Amino acid sequence: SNLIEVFVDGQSVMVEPGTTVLQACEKVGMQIPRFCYHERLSVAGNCRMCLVEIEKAPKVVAACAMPVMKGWNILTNSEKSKKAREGVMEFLLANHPLDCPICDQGGECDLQDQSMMFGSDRSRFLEGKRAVEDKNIGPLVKTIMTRCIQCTRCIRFASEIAGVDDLGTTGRGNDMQVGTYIEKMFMSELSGNIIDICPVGALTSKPYAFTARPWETRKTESIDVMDAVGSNIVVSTRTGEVMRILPRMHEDINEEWISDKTRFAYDGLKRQRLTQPMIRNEKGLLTYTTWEDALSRVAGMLQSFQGNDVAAIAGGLVDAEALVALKDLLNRVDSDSLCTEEVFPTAGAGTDLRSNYLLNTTIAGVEEADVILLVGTNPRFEAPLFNARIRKSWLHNDLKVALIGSPVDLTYRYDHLGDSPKILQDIASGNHPFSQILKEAKKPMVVLGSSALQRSDGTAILAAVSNIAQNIRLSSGVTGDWKVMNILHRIASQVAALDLGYKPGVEAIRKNPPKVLFLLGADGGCITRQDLPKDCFIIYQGHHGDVGAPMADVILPGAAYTEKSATYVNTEGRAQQTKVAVTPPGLAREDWKIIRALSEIAGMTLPYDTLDQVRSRLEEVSPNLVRYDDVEGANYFQQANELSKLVNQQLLADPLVPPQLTIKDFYMTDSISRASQTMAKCVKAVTEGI
Amino acid sequence: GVRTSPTGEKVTHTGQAYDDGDYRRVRFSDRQKEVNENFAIDLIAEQPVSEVGSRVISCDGGGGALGHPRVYINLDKETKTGTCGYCGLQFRQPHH
Amino acid sequence: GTSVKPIFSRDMNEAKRRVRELYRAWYREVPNTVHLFQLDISVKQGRDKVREMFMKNAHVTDPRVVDLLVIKGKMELEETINVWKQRTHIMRFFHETEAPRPTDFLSKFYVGHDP
Amino acid sequence: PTTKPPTARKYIWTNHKFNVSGTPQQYVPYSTTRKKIQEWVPPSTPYK
Amino acid sequence: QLIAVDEKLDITTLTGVPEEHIKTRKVRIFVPARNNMQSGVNNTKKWKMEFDTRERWENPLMGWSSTADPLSNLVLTFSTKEDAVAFAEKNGWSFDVEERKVPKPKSKSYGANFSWNKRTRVSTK
Amino acid sequence: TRPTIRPRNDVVHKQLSAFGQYVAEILPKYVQQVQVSCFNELEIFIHPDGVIPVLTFLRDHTNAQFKSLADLTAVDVPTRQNRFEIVYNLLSLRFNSRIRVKTYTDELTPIESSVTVYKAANWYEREIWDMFGVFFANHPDLRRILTDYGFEGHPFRKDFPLSGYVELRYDDEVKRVVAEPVELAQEFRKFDLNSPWEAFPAYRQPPE
Amino acid sequence: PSGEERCIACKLCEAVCPAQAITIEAEPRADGSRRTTRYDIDMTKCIYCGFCQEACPVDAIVEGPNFEFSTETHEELLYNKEKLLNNGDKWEAEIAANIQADYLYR
Amino acid sequence: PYDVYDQVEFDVPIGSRGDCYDRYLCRVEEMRQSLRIISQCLNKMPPGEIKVDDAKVSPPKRAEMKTSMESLIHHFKLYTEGYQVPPGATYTAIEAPKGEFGVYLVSDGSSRPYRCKIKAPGFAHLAGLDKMSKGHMLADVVAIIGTQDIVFGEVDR
Amino acid sequence: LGLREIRIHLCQRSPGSQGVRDFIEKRYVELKKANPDLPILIRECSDVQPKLWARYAFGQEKNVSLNNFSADQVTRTLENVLSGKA
Ligand code: SF4
Ligand code: SF4
Ligand code: SF4
Ligand code: SF4
Ligand code: FES
Ligand SMILES: [Mg+2]
Numbered sequence A: 001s002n003l004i005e006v007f008v009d010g011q012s013v014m015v016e017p018g019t020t021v022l023q024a025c026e027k028v029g030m031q032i033p034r035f036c037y038h039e040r041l042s043v044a045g046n047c048r049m050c051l052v053e054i055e056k057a058p059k060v061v062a063a064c065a066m067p068v069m070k071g072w073n074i075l076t077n078s079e080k081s082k083k084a085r086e087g088v089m090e091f092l093l094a095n096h097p098l099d100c101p102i103c104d105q106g107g108e109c110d111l112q113d114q115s116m117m118f119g120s121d122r123s124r125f126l127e128g129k130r131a132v133e134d135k136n137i138g139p140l141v142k143t144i145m146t147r148c149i150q151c152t153r154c155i156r157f158a159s160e161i162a163g164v165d166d167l168g169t170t171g172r173g174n175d176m177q178v179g180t181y182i183e184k185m186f187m188s189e190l191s192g193n194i195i196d197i198c199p200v201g202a203l204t205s206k207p208y209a210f211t212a213r214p215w216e217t218r219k220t221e222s223i224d225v226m227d228a229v230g231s232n233i234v235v236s237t238r239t240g241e242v243m244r245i246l247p248r249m250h251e252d253i254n255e256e257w258i259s260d261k262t263r264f265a266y267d268g269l270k271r272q273r274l275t276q277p278m279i280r281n282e283k284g285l286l287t288y289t290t291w292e293d294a295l296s297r298v299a300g301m302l303q304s305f306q307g308n309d310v311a312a313i314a315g316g317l318v319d320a321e322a323l324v325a326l327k328d329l330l331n332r333v334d335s336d337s338l339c340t341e342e343v344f345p346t347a348g349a350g351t352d353l354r355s356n357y358l359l360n361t362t363i364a365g366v367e368e369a370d371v372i373l374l375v376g377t378n379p380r381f382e383a384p385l386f387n388a389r390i391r392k393s394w395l396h397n398d399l400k401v402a403l404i405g406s407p408v409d410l411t412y413r414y415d416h417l418g419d420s421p422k423i424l425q426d427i428a429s430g431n432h433p434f435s436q437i438l439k440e441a442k443k444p445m446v447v448l449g450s451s452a453l454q455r456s457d458g459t460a461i462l463a464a465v466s467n468i469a470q471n472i473r474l475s476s477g478v479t480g481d482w483k484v485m486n487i488l489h490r491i492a493s494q495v496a497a498l499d500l501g502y503k504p505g506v507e508a509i510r511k512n513p514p515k516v517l518f519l520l521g522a523d524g525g526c527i528t529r530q531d532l533p534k535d536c537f538i539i540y541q542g543h544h545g546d547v548g549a550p551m552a553d554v555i556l557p558g559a560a561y562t563e564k565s566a567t568y569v570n571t572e573g574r575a576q577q578t579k580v581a582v583t584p585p586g587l588a589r590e591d592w593k594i595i596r597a598l599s600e601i602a603g604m605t606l607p608y609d610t611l612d613q614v615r616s617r618l619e620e621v622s623p624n625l626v627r628y629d630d631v632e633g634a635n636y637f638q639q640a641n642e643l644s645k646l647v648n649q650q651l652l653a654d655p656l657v658p659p660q661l662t663i664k665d666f667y668m669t670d671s672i673s674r675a676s677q678t679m680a681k682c683v684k685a686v687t688e689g690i
Numbered sequence B: 001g002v003r004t005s006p007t008g009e010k011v012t013h014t015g016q017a018y019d020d021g022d023y024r025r026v027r028f029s030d031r032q033k034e035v036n037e038n039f040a041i042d043l044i045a046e047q048p049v050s051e052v053g054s055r056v057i058s059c060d061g062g063g064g065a066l067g068h069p070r071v072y073i074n075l076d077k078e079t080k081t082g083t084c085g086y087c088g089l090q091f092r093q094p095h096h
Numbered sequence C: 001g002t003s004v005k006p007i008f009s010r011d012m013n014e015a016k017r018r019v020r021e022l023y024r025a026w027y028r029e030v031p032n033t034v035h036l037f038q039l040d041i042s043v044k045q046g047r048d049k050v051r052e053m054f055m056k057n058a059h060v061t062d063p064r065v066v067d068l069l070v071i072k073g074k075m076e077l078e079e080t081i082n083v084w085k086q087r088t089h090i091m092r093f094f095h096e097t098e099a100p101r102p103t104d105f106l107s108k109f110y111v112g113h114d115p
Numbered sequence D: 001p002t003t004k005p006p007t008a009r010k011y012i013w014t015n016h017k018f019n020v021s022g023t024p025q026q027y028v029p030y031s032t033t034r035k036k037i038q039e040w041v042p043p044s045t046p047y048k
Numbered sequence E: 001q002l003i004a005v006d007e008k009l010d011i012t013t014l015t016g017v018p019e020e021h022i023k024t025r026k027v028r029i030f031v032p033a034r035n036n037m038q039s040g041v042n043n044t045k046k047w048k049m050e051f052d053t054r055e056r057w058e059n060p061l062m063g064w065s066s067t068a069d070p071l072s073n074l075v076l077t078f079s080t081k082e083d084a085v086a087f088a089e090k091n092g093w094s095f096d097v098e099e100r101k102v103p104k105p106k107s108k109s110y111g112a113n114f115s116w117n118k119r120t121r122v123s124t125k
Numbered sequence F: 001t002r003p004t005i006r007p008r009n010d011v012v013h014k015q016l017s018a019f020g021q022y023v024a025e026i027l028p029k030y031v032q033q034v035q036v037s038c039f040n041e042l043e044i045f046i047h048p049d050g051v052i053p054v055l056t057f058l059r060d061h062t063n064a065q066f067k068s069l070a071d072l073t074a075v076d077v078p079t080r081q082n083r084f085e086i087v088y089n090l091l092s093l094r095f096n097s098r099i100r101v102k103t104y105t106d107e108l109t110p111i112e113s114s115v116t117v118y119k120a121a122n123w124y125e126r127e128i129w130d131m132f133g134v135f136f137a138n139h140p141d142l143r144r145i146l147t148d149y150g151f152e153g154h155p156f157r158k159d160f161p162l163s164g165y166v167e168l169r170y171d172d173e174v175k176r177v178v179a180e181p182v183e184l185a186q187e188f189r190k191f192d193l194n195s196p197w198e199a200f201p202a203y204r205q206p207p208e
Numbered sequence G: 001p002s003g004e005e006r007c008i009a010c011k012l013c014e015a016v017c018p019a020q021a022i023t024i025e026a027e028p029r030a031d032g033s034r035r036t037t038r039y040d041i042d043m044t045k046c047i048y049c050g051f052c053q054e055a056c057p058v059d060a061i062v063e064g065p066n067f068e069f070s071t072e073t074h075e076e077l078l079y080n081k082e083k084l085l086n087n088g089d090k091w092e093a094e095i096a097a098n099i100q101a102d103y104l105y106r
Numbered sequence H: 001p002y003d004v005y006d007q008v009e010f011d012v013p014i015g016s017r018g019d020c021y022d023r024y025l026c027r028v029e030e031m032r033q034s035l036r037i038i039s040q041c042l043n044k045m046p047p048g049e050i051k052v053d054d055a056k057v058s059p060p061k062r063a064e065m066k067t068s069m070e071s072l073i074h075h076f077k078l079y080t081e082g083y084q085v086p087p088g089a090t091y092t093a094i095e096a097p098k099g100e101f102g103v104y105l106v107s108d109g110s111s112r113p114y115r116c117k118i119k120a121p122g123f124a125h126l127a128g129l130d131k132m133s134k135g136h137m138l139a140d141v142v143a144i145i146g147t148q149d150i151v152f153g154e155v156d157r
Numbered sequence I: 001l002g003l004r005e006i007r008i009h010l011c012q013r014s015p016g017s018q019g020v021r022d023f024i025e026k027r028y029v030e031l032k033k034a035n036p037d038l039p040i041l042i043r044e045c046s047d048v049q050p051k052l053w054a055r056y057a058f059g060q061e062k063n064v065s066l067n068n069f070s071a072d073q074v075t076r077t078l079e080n081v082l083s084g085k086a
């Protein structure tokens, strides 16, 4: 091929042209020291720590920024490279403050470890150091700029990954500072990530400040559930208590970053917690009882009624195990009124065809598209990692973006087609020029959010989008297995519920008011006691005291997503399982365990006893759930599209306004976020700045 | 500044005090609860703010090698006073 | 292939024979141990416990594992002969002081998070 | 200390205490941190 | 001299592990993820086998953390996935194995920052 | 090489290399490898079936005569198919030298006991059986030497928990010392002290 | 000397303790200072090796010169932050004298 | 010799019968030779530092730690993580007062030893006690145990 | 006795599911025309026998294999399942 031969310490290796010296060294198996180089960020060349010697070359080159050519022999462990590294570390540590005992990055500092391995062991700096005043960029990132090494990594991240140009370098020479030059809060859905990239303790986590040390903590690899992206996380705990949340690398979902809500809303896991079962007393107030009493009352009420009189509503943070257990329990009493808070149009294919409600192109496959159409969606606050992927493809692949909806700020330039849903029909009709501009697109892509489906036009909007996709496929031809049509979800439990046969939306409850209602973590406020019959029985089974708790008759304390090994399906249809980091507080138990115990008390004993048996039941109900990294699936666009042409509901003259209009609406979305002091601080800071 | 709990115990400088319903209080009957009377926050809040005429000031806690590691504090911000990270002493430029 | 070096038995018959000899020795020794250590149990209880401990390893189908278990049992019997143990070591086989852990789902659900 | 007294500080005890084991003044250990998890407080108003 | 027996290896009955710590535990075989606070990759070379987390409670006296299970602090290191799987099968532990994740090759060019027409132009450096 | 670096001796290195080649030439049936460390320590890796012959040679040959058995121990490496590694350390007083012989075994494969060669090995062998579970054939009496009577499991294996499985206390209802499942008031804090940024490039491994 | 405790919750003494006898929990104080909320030393686990007092970068934890502190019960040998601060306030005179006498050898 | 022993002169007592009396006389003469070596060490004390001037292995001085950045970093890393030992296995033996005391140390390259086997002479001596107490009175066993110089801390480990 | 839902598990790349796939790609939409309220879930297996699951009232479920079934065979057993005859 076009691969060229380069030598590292006399060992030959093939590298594609354009590969830097650092990448060749990684290919051989060695890691060049670095401070400013980040693979996901543009090359800077500031820190000069990656200086390496090329054989028969009198000058030391920067391995991060120097493309390699045929014949070079990279002498990484040569005397010249070692001396260069020692000099660079000496210059870096000349003005660094002696803050290691009080620094929040004590045992996880790149400066410390690289000084230990590649630097010297003493100082000949006999002068006084410098000191710069601290900056204030909000209540999330604690800023101590005396420790800054001026690697300009946060600046590059903000400019490219986050699309926010707030950060910059002011001044010249030794006293050049990194900051905003004004009293401004660096606010974005990806603001916290600058803590991770910053190699030193200049930028640290404010809520996590002075709490723990890295060697103390235990790392548990789990899945984030605050959004439908399903970004992988590492829960860092210490003596049975969650200390912090860190991003985990996955090149196909979240790369290496996580959203602010994912990162800083773990605090809500320590407030408003449901710890014991509660029942209504003679006076009508909630009082603590034992598991036996509450289970007996619920089982008696479940035995007394039967059929459509019983019902269940699934929340936005429920796992597949609990969903299938509750489905089995309500099937043993001959019921099918199983509903979720988010609605999905059931006209036509509905939920029978899996490809009808998924992000078929996938987050990884976003990078291959050339045009994209967003319909009634605000991906910045509904799926921040999806928006980050779109921004990365826009910056690198020159992708073209168009949005139909309110002119929200997406951190990149797009084409505002309009507001009214009628434009969709226009795009289907062919009068709009955007139909033409997307006709030539080799890999077009259409994304429709669940926010546009929550309104009464869900069926008609979905039909119009499917018609647009059909026009794309028929006119431009079948490019391959491209899977133009996409749908982006907002809650983590929606896809898993839909795969299990849950009926989307709460319309069934309204049509047939039940006598006993199961609230499996339903805190959306969709169903109140006004639209239910009198003396109705409400069972709430969750982990937080929220809008759904005070209206209940029996409260069963469940477990949070960090307290159970549970399966969640993200918006691409990929199923991932979390791991137990801590145990549920007080008398709270696992959700599926609660359902099984209630079933056995009521006499309708469920077949499964352990987690493996519940997952076997999940495999029986759905084959896809057991696979834990598979995302591929069959393309059944034709069948769903043909079934969607029967009903002809019309669009109303209401503009597509997403709920997430402004950053102030992004912080508090679910029960965990509403119970977090950090999220309240963020909302207060965004509303009024100092 | 040692306060008293509503039950009657003394509150530690960390704010710890068993509430009315806690059974662990029984460990103190016929005995005493060990509490340090001198609170570090109150003792350091009454220290005078040092007035120096330099932009950057060095602090080692007093005593040289018997103090804390030497650090440098910047006093450009005239709104507040620079505070030592270890010792907690305050420094300020001569305004007006 | 899967050729391995033997310990004492070439096949399962010899291992079964050694198990039988070890059982004979333990059965013969139980009453002497009960009398000598001044146990509160009867000879019937001791023989039942020996039978239970032998049947605990009834699913082993590897002659090497079987005769290694036989070696361990012979070592323990020799330990019991020479009064190298005491009453506590002998009585640790009965767990008279440990609470009985439940088995059904509901009890384990009530006590704690243990599956 | 008569020849050269120790340095005087405001936090140094002015009254030395001997060993107080087996005495109503003995030291009783206890946890110093606050509560970790806060439980939900049910409302005092009936739902109906 | 050689038995030449054909059966899977099983040393469950010789390790002395209690029965409740054999058929109830669920081990995990994985390559530990890189700590996002650091750019070093030297801790993601070997495979790790670790047991599932169990209950920890606060000590009634002195507030310490107490654990009732012995295997909580145990962690084992294996050169390859096959060796760890073989160990787990030999000791009779049910295991969950996750494929190693390696960052994909990325093409980085210094020239892109000063682009004439493409959007990769940097606003500042 | 300034006074902070340990001085290197080359004559001893050459002598040990020559003797390793000599030994490997004499016993090509059993020796699988010979190594000399940077600090002048010679080690010989042999087949398990050659424990009795090779040792005997090193004890009786006019040129070796390694009379004393300094130490005998085992090393557990769970990532290997042959789990346990047996190490013999021999001291020759006539030539003022030391040698090491290394052998491999697993849980079920026995190793021939070297009590006939060195009497000192006797207790050492028992210790191995007490700590790792390696069975030694033709031993005068093989039994536990260090653990409590009736102790279940071999503590020195890498998969054995640090605190064990049972703990002892005194019960007044039965008026005796009883064993219970272990429960710690404070759990042993595990520290992740190992760090990225490898320190020794000379030991770097191929990226397979 | 101003009266503020020297400890800054760097957790070096906890990490260096061979017997794991030190337990530390910390959080920002009311004025934002880095201070401990819990500092426990188990005197029945401590081996009196002195690693804690030599790993401390601010001379916060010291191993005093008192040795007559026997106890009639096990519980009173589990020191918390209040007891250690009381010990410091009680022995500061001769502790500081010994530190002054010996700090040139360290 | 390991440290400065090849630089001190002393005599090595040797028995002639192998009984308890000869070993007692040998121990007394070893005490006298220890006094000789102590005198030589007192007379020939050199000046200089007391630990290797390698801050990546030995912690720096307190003043250097509190004034220098590299010293503070190295103190932090040495007292939190420790120093990494290159991979390898060694057997180091010295002439402890009870005989040859040895340690077989195996390091995998980290800051924690992979294996540390301890060879104590008491183990072998107590193993040979059975041979050495053949055809002797009951009261002779106590004398033989005493002359073996048995401390069970090293025997049991 | 009342059917509540049906599920069809088919393997995307296996040849044993081949004919079953054709079934959908030819007539599933028509089937959905005849049953506008019956839920017919469709899921993908992996190296597993193609199967059809039928759920009746009160949680009773019965499964039938679909290996190497032609389109006619699978549609025939489907009409047998919905028609109630056995
Ligand atoms: S940034 Fe690193 S080197 Fe600087 S004080 Fe913090 S831990 Fe120490
Ligand atoms: S704050 Fe951190 S990331 Fe930003 S320039 Fe300074 S060291 Fe680099
Ligand atoms: S002296 Fe005690 S508390 Fe200090 S490090 Fe040693 S064992 Fe730990
Ligand atoms: S006592 Fe010293 S070493 Fe321990 S945490 Fe406090 S400052 Fe750090
Ligand atoms: S890593 Fe290349 S110059 Fe900084
Ligand atoms: Mg940082």
Ligand SMILES: [Zn+2]
Pocket (backbone or CB within 6 Å): B059, B060, B061, B068, B084, B085, B086, B087, B088, B089
């Ligand atoms: Zn200070």
